[PDB]
Design a protein around this ligand. Structure first.
Ligand SMILES: *[C@@H]1O[C@H](CO)[C@@H](O[C@@H]2O[C@H](CO)[C@@H](O)[C@H](O)[C@H]2NC(C)=O)[C@H](O)[C@H]1NC(C)=O
Ligand code: NAG
Ligand code: NAG
Ligand code: NAG
Ligand code: CU
Ligand code: CU
Ligand code: CU
Ligand code: CU
Lengths: 338, 338
């Protein structure tokens, strides 16, 4: 199946040429023009194929974060997105990732976020005198985060005229309040907001943090909890840092986060870090799983196993077992990271 | 509104005469014959009006246990179930509650579970050598519970030929495995299983335990947590105690628990205990609320407030705000407990 001949390579965004960057960006725009597949009565707010991906994430958020299926489900998700870009948008380039480490002293100068024509758009319109973001996970003390250097709609770049249609589902706001639609799958068109927060990166996504994550995680449990943020440490891990550092809407919504176009580059890096960690010890780590099928095991559910079946709903793909997802060179996958 | 004239009393099941016990039983059996309202595409496995109540519980479980609405939602839920009994089944008697304390040395002799024609059916067919029930609440060490003196389908009484149609959703088994239907709102007819476990009552629902709950809980948070089971404490509360002591299916499934006909008596007591606790200090406790709109706040959601609206779907009644649910003698309610 996976052979040296049909091996694809996943590459840092900093390693894409100007022409390669736009090829990718244009593909994603093409996803935002194509009509949605999700049946209107299940997600009335859906319009585009991109919406289809956003909807499944909202629909499944409760069963795909702090579960045994978190890493694998996301690996599939971004895989089937890539497959959309290829099969429907005629993309023939490589899957990009966002190397957090390289932008942690100055996020506004990040090639992902410089706001130029080769970025995923940039900062939001500056809003002064904003309160702090307070994240409560469960019932531990809230983590305190700076509001960032934007806050309003994105000012420049290829996604300035991009309409976000679904959400908000649980959007953290400056000051600590939280916006939640009666149901986030209905039509609520608005612009993508961002408030770039370099400080957040300084705390959680520096190169020391990333290496620590890889080298000090003895078991999948330790790995995936350190990545997501062990509730009660005041860490939100690399995965939280990457999300909240984008600020804005839906940067700060756990459910609607794919609504931000940097999601895919963010999760490319998640997948890369995971893949790396796995490969330090394939015999024990290749197929390791820990956790249940529910967020923090609340309500309790069965332990996830290789036999556990997961899907992307109407976004793309079909039902697929976990044993088919454990390797980037097995099942439906045949790629590495450079 | 509610006056001394139209006031209703809720009574201990032990205080029902043989005829009054039968009158209630026949009303519940009548709900198990009347056709459901839930539109079939939403719950394919619902057949009866009783099922409607089960289905809504399954649907909303994620947002009614360990939330700010837990107590108020259940008080409404059981009121609306009493209303179905009056309006559709001609019941004119009182709401019954199950006093856990009075049966905590020997549950098999309980007037609720004695297997007679005046009980909610009794124990299940005996199944020897069953392993221990292991409840994993969130990510804390497992709570061991004995397997009880039953296991099979109920052997006697009004509900021996009662068909349970929905679920399982997250059914804990002896040995520590858990059965979960791919989706539990589909048609899965089967008998009600029980495995009456006195020992669980001995640990969690004694008169000392119930009095501790009321007198030692200084605020609504302390109260609702102690009642449900504070996570990590190795306690499951009176709330968990009541359910798990029934054993069987769906006694051991947090989603489907209304499928067990004792659920309503159990929750009369829960409401009684809450009412009692409110009435020790009405200035502070009448409208006291704490917690969010998600199970253990996972994922994070807004704080429940008096303006938070809840519904029981197609079971009965309409949307209603929390402020209207706080008093047994205001809003739609006019009752007390003896
Ligand atoms: C949200 O997820 C639910 C499942 O949790 C999806 O509904 C299921 O879809 C399949 C269709 O193949 C049915 O056969 C199941 O019986 C459905 N289950 C339930 C509980 O409805 C639904 O597709 C998702 N909604 C969206 C918009 O993706
Ligand atoms: C929610 O209530 C708690 C007190 O229980 C408090 O810490 C916090 O201010 C409230 N949260 C919001 C978002 O208002
Ligand atoms: C379920 O798996 C968890 C780890 O995810 C483990 O602690 C527990 O012992 C397992 N139990 C069973 C019965 O599978
Ligand atoms: C379940 O809850 C959803 C979310 O509000 C609702 O729209 C749907 O009607 C409910 N289904 C049933 C069977 O009550
Ligand atoms: Cu996700
Ligand atoms: Cu993410
Ligand atoms: Cu309940
Ligand atoms: Cu209950």
């Amino acid at each position: 199946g996976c052979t040296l001949q049909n091996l694809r390579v996943r590459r840092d965004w900093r390693a894409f040429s100007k022409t390669q960057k736009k090829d990718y960006i244009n593909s994603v725009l093409c996803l935002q023009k194509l009509p949605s597949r999700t049946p209107a009565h299940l997600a009335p707010g859906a319009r585009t194929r991109y919406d289809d991906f956003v909807a499944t994430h909202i629909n499944q958020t409760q069963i795909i974060h702090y579960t045994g299926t978190f890493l694998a489900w996301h690996r599939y998700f971004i895989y089937e997105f890539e497959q959309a870009l290829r099969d429907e948008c005629s993309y023939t380039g490589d899957y990009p990732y966002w190397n957090w480490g390289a932008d942690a002293d100055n996020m506004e100068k990040s090639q992902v976020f410089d706001g130029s024509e080769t970025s995923m758009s940039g900062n939001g319109e500056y809003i002064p005198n904003q309160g702090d973001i307070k994240l409560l996970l469960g019932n531990y003390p809230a983590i305190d985060l700076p509001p960032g250097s934007g806050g309003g709609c994105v000012t420049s770049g290829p996604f300035k005229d991009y309409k976000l249609n679904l959400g908000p589902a649980a959007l953290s706001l400056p000051g600590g309040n939280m916006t939640a639609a009666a149901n986030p799958l209905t039509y609520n068109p608005r612009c993508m907001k961002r408030s770039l927060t370099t400080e957040i990166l300084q705390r959680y996504n520096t190169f020391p943090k990333i290496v620590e994550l890889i080298l000090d995680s003895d078991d999948i449990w330790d790995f995936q909890m350190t990545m997501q943020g062990v509730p009660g440490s005041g860490s939100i891990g690399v995965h939280g840092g990457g999300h909240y550092s984008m600020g804005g809407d839906p940067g700060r919504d756990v459910y609607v986060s794919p609504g931000d176009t940097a999601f895919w580059l963010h999760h490319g890096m998640i997948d890369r870090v995971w893949w790396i960690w796995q490969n330090l010890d394939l015999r024990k780590r290749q197929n390791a799983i820990s956790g249940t099928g529910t967020f923090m095991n609340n309500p309790a559910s069965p332990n996830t196993t290789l036999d556990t079946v997961i899907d992307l709903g109407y976004a793309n793909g079909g039902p697929i077992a976990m044993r088919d997802l454990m390797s980037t060179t097995a099942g439906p996958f045949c790629y590495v990271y450079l």
